[PDB]
Amino acid sequence: VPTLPLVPXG
Amino acid sequence: VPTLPLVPXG
Amino acid sequence: DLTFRLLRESFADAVSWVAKNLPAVPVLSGVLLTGSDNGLTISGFDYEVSAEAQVGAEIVSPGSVLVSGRLLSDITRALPNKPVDVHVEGNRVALTCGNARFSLPTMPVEDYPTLPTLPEETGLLPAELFAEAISQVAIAAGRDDTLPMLTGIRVEILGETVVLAATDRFRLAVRELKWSASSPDIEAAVLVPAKTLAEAAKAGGGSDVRLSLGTGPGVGKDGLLGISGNGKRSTTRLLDAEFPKFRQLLPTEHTAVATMDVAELIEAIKLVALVADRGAQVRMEFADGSVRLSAGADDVGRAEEDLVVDYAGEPLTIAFNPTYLTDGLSSLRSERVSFGFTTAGKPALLRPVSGDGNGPFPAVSTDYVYLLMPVRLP
Amino acid sequence: DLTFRLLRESFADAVSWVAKNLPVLSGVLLTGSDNGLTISGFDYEVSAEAQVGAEIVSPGSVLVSGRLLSDITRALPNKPVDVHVEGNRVALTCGNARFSLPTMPVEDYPTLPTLPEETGLLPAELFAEAISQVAIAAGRDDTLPMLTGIRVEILGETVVLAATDRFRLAVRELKWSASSPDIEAAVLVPAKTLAEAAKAGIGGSDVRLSLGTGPGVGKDGLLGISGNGKRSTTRLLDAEFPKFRQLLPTEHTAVATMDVAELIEAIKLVALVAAQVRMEFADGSVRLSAGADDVGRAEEDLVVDYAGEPLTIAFNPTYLTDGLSSLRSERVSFGFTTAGKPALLRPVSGNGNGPFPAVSTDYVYLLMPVRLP
């Protein structure tokens, strides 16, 4: 279950 | 809270 | 193997009713599908209750299959109103409905318990009557009681007369009705788990309900009650308990009688109980013309309302469990209610009244009565 | 002390605002004056206040149980209600029903916060819709408080609302009337609270948002909401919201447009076995599937207007249906690149090999896939 590639965050 | 007068029962 | 085709609505109606009656052994998670000739049988068994529904189906190839009931129930409910194709291939069931295709794992049919035989039919009545009568009485049952006797609905049969009763020690509901008896002298008194019965009568509906307890000297002897109608049948085990005698609690007359409107009393109770201490009680002060409904105490709040009453007898103050009281009022299924009092911390009798002094006042004969114990003033 | 009379429906409505938005803290404050009746509820996070027309026979103030006052006014018949403060009790009369409720000392009640200066105004139905659209995407985990908000960015007459839980990002842009064209603002508001306010039925045409003006925007730590004699304040979240705009693709290697209602139904249908639903897009059709042989499998083929090479991609079915229900349009466009990268969902109302440029919309729901087994 990857996150969205929010930087930072993920 | 009395019960009904059922015999046996109350 | 087994492969059949039938309309969705029929399939779903049959499957849901097996799942409403069922509703330990992991094999009991399954439901049995059996196709023979031009009919589909859907069976479930839990050792306490069995349920079986028969419907018309295009049987392309006879046979049997055991699949998850929960899953089959969920799917057939969520299916479009289209024809459903079912095909058992290997150890899997293919279900097809339009563009949607399902493949479910099976379980071996050999492990499924045999469903008990229904007793001989004892009598029949309209399903609507049965549904109403049972829902009327079941409200008084000690459902979820740890004392098995209170969890039952008593069924008394004498010829064409059926009497239904239930109690939780605080209210007693009694319903008398007429049915078509298998014979004029059939006689029986059994005790049936109330929740199972209520659930059956609920999904019962069709035109006829048929009750199967047996006949002759063998009525009740099988320990099973069969309920059938509209292609459906179920069995429930009887309770092994004796029911209290109650007819001696129904007076010939009353020291006071109060008649009033059911709908407005129910609402007024809802309203004043908003401040009732733990909802333990509501007070009723009856007098000529009027009754004051009150609840609560000064620390949280007080509430009262005066309602019109057709009242006979001397003034009377009596308190009730508000929930037990509204349960009884809602069970009347009539516009008006009469309260019969003997007073002195004895039960009150609630009877249904249709829209159209000094005493004692003779009781009026009705086919339904809800006996309600008062609570003591604090 | 206080004595007044007003219609039940009006009374219940005012008490309703305060109840839906919220020892001594269990009370609501009733105040009677020339400006009618005010009902105030205080909480340390959210305060709420409602003012209505009433016959103030005698002016004053009284503090009573909020929960109890709400239950009563909700249940009362639709008739005039009379309220009389006699001693340390309040008499409430409506038809033949009489209530006598205990009071608490009014001086004990904490002061409600003052709303910041007005920042802008938008229609109430638009406010309600936009907040429910983006609120679905907020996190509900207080160990990640930076996700439990709705971002409100104000750039003049443009407002942008956003929320994410790291898996979906919902963004709604809308036009409103600002206090000035150069007003600027980014604040983060608790999502549950704001979603609650948006559906509490403020009534009337207008919602005014109050965050302050100029450099003093957000400085009070409060979002004010007001309109129709009602108002509330909400404590702002201190966390920073993620930079989200760069996650919005400008082009897609494949684009699918579908019917929203029928995709939602098919997902509910196929998900009855699963987790994740899998989607196999090809020209003209998509196979939606779920499950595994151990518990059972489901699949359904749906019509799709598809541009690009075939793509197989999987989603959390709940997150996917949340997104589809947030669109409020008959059709959906999916903007794709690969099976491990966000899918962009856009509302659609009823050419070559690519890549295909993104079409601009005032709403987007960006959804991260899950990996295939």
Side-chain angles (χ1 to χ4, degrees), chain A, chain B, chain C residues 1-37 39-88 90 92-109 111-142 144-220 222-378, chain D residues 1-24 26-34 36-85 87-191 193-218 220-373:
Chain A
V1 193
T3 75
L4 252 9
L6 293 161
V7 305
Chain B
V1 189
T3 68
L4 253 13
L6 300 162
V7 311
Chain C
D1 228 40
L2 181 69
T3 116
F4 64 88
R5 169 185 266 247
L6 87 173
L7 290 178
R8 172 237 152 235
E9 150 135 292
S10 181
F11 194 18
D13 172 63
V15 166
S16 201
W17 179 81
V18 168
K20 285 182 181 189
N21 280 106
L22 261 290
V25 198
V27 196
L28 306 183
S29 70
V31 290
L32 190 70
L33 306 196
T34 303
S36 272
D37 284 88
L40 179 65
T41 321
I42 296 159
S43 320
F45 192 32
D46 125 277
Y47 296 111
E48 288 294 302
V49 179
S50 70
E52 191 167 73
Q54 218 159 233
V55 292
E58 182 187 344
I59 305 303
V60 186
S61 171
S64 192
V65 77
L66 178 58
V67 301
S68 173
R70 156 207 130 248
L71 192 58
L72 186 65
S73 180
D74 291 344
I75 299 172
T76 57
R77 278 195 274 107
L79 244 16
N81 228 337
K82 299 187 155 220
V84 183
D85 286 312
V86 176
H87 185 287
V88 183
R92 300 189 75 70
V93 187
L95 186 152
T96 298
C97 180
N99 299 313
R101 296 171 300 272
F102 292 88
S103 181
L104 315 177
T106 59
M107 306 161 79
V109 297
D111 282 339
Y112 209 64
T114 316
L115 283 84
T117 316
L118 273 68
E120 285 191 347
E121 188 182 296
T122 307
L124 63 85
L125 72 165
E128 250 312 296
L129 181 56
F130 189 59
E132 155 173 288
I134 288 292
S135 85
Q136 262 188 319
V137 169
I139 191 121
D144 317 318
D145 206 286
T146 43
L147 200 285
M149 156 179 51
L150 304 171
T151 70
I153 291 180
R154 165 173 182 89
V155 182
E156 306 176 8
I157 298 166
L158 183 61
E160 69 190 340
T161 305
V162 175
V163 173
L164 306 160
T167 189
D168 66 352
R169 295 178 302 141
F170 303 105
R171 50 260 175 90
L172 161 80
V174 191
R175 175 62 189 275
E176 162 166 354
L177 60 81
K178 292 293 174 289
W179 74 342
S180 301
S182 52
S183 56
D185 304 315
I186 188 84
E187 185 181 12
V190 297
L191 188 60
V192 188
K195 296 157 67 178
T196 310
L197 200 50
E199 192 54 53
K202 213 133 65 188
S207 66
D208 66 290
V209 160
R210 294 152 183 266
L211 296 183
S212 294
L213 291 166
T215 52
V219 199
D222 292 284
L224 288 174
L225 164 67
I227 310 164
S228 48
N230 193 28
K232 308 174 181 166
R233 68 184 66 235
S234 67
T235 64
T236 173
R237 293 227 270 177
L238 299 175
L239 285 166
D240 201 354
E242 62 171 26
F243 196 80
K245 328 226 121 288
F246 57 90
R247 278 167 171 90
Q248 74 288 358
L249 295 188
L250 308 180
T252 226
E253 68 194 5
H254 304 288
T255 51
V257 181
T259 298
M260 59 198 302
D261 187 270
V262 167
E264 85 165 301
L265 176 54
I266 287 184
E267 191 217 332
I269 293 167
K270 302 299 173 65
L271 182 57
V272 308
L274 278 186
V275 306
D277 173 26
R278 287 165 273 172
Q281 81 181 240
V282 285
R283 195 194 299 243
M284 310 189 66
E285 299 173 58
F286 292 97
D288 180 43
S290 184
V291 67
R292 177 161 297 168
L293 192 77
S294 73
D298 264 25
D299 63 316
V300 158
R302 294 195 164 266
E304 75 191 45
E305 170 154 39
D306 298 311
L307 310 142
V308 171
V309 59
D310 189 47
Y311 187 74
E314 285 300 282
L316 175 52
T317 295
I318 187 174
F320 296 115
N321 179 316
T323 303
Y324 295 169
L325 177 51
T326 62
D327 279 3
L329 291 167
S330 290
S331 73
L332 293 177
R333 319 294 171 88
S334 61
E335 184 191 306
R336 296 180 63 71
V337 48
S338 68
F339 297 77
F341 303 109
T342 283
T343 319
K346 291 284 212 182
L349 276 84
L350 283 67
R351 298 179 187 271
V353 175
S354 82
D356 47 52
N358 274 9
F361 317 100
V364 172
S365 179
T366 49
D367 60 21
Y368 181 71
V369 59
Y370 179 96
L371 195 55
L372 182 62
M373 203 58 187
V375 297
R376 293 182 180 90
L377 298 315
Chain D
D1 308 31
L2 176 59
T3 299
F4 65 89
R5 163 184 313 144
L6 79 170
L7 288 180
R8 176 250 158 228
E9 184 200 308
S10 175
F11 197 10
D13 182 71
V15 171
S16 184
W17 175 252
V18 178
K20 291 184 160 186
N21 277 285
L22 284 208
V24 196
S26 75
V28 296
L29 184 65
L30 319 175
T31 297
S33 60
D34 282 321
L37 176 79
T38 300
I39 302 157
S40 320
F42 175 90
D43 170 276
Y44 289 102
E45 296 299 306
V46 171
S47 292
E49 196 162 47
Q51 194 196 302
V52 297
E55 294 188 277
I56 310 303
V57 178
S58 171
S61 161
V62 67
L63 180 63
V64 306
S65 162
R67 192 60 255 149
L68 200 45
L69 185 59
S70 173
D71 294 340
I72 296 176
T73 53
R74 291 166 77 257
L76 251 13
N78 229 312
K79 295 169 71 153
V81 174
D82 287 276
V83 173
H84 184 20
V85 176
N88 66 338
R89 296 202 74 88
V90 182
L92 193 154
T93 305
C94 184
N96 295 123
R98 287 174 305 282
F99 292 83
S100 179
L101 304 188
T103 64
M104 294 166 276
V106 169
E107 331 82 79
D108 293 339
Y109 213 60
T111 304
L112 280 79
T114 318
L115 277 74
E117 284 199 311
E118 280 195 39
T119 309
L121 174 153
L122 74 161
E125 286 180 353
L126 172 59
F127 177 71
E129 163 187 274
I131 295 297
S132 75
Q133 284 182 296
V134 307
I136 194 63
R140 314 179 182 94
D141 187 351
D142 289 320
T143 58
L144 298 178
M146 66 290 313
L147 303 182
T148 63
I150 291 172
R151 174 166 177 88
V152 188
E153 322 189 343
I154 300 166
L155 304 330
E157 77 176 14
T158 298
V159 177
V160 176
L161 306 158
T164 182
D165 62 350
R166 296 174 301 147
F167 303 103
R168 47 262 180 88
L169 163 80
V171 190
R172 175 68 191 267
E173 172 178 326
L174 63 91
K175 299 268 176 287
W176 77 339
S177 315
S179 62
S180 67
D182 283 45
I183 198 103
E184 261 199 296
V187 297
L188 184 61
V189 185
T193 299
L194 185 52
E196 217 60 33
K199 70 184 192 261
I202 186 185
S205 56
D206 306 340
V207 163
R208 299 167 185 256
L209 300 192
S210 289
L211 294 166
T213 50
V217 163
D220 298 315
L222 298 176
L223 170 69
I225 301 166
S226 62
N228 200 25
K230 303 179 189 157
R231 48 159 129 244
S232 68
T233 62
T234 311
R235 277 287 293 161
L236 296 172
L237 287 170
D238 288 319
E240 278 287 349
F241 196 77
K243 253 52 189 149
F244 59 88
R245 272 175 181 95
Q246 76 285 19
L247 265 63
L248 305 170
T250 64
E251 53 178 37
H252 309 284
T253 48
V255 177
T257 83
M258 302 186 57
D259 184 273
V260 165
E262 102 180 6
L263 180 54
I264 288 174
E265 204 205 339
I267 292 161
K268 292 194 202 310
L269 182 58
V270 293
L272 279 181
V273 286
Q276 77 168 237
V277 293
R278 297 162 213 91
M279 305 188 79
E280 305 169 80
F281 290 94
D283 192 348
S285 182
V286 62
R287 181 156 298 167
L288 182 68
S289 77
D293 300 77
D294 73 318
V295 77
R297 299 188 165 268
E299 82 187 32
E300 183 171 5
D301 301 304
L302 283 67
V303 166
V304 67
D305 174 32
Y306 189 70
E309 284 302 274
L311 174 76
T312 298
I313 188 166
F315 296 113
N316 179 320
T318 297
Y319 295 171
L320 179 52
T321 63
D322 285 353
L324 294 163
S325 304
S326 67
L327 297 177
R328 316 304 167 81
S329 61
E330 177 196 306
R331 295 179 62 82
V332 48
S333 128
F334 286 95
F336 299 117
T337 52
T338 61
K341 283 299 176 78
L344 201 130
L345 280 69
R346 284 178 195 281
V348 171
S349 185
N351 201 329
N353 280 323
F356 315 96
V359 179
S360 78
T361 46
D362 57 17
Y363 183 70
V364 308
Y365 182 97
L366 191 64
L367 175 65
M368 195 66 182
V370 290
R371 301 198 192 282
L372 302 154

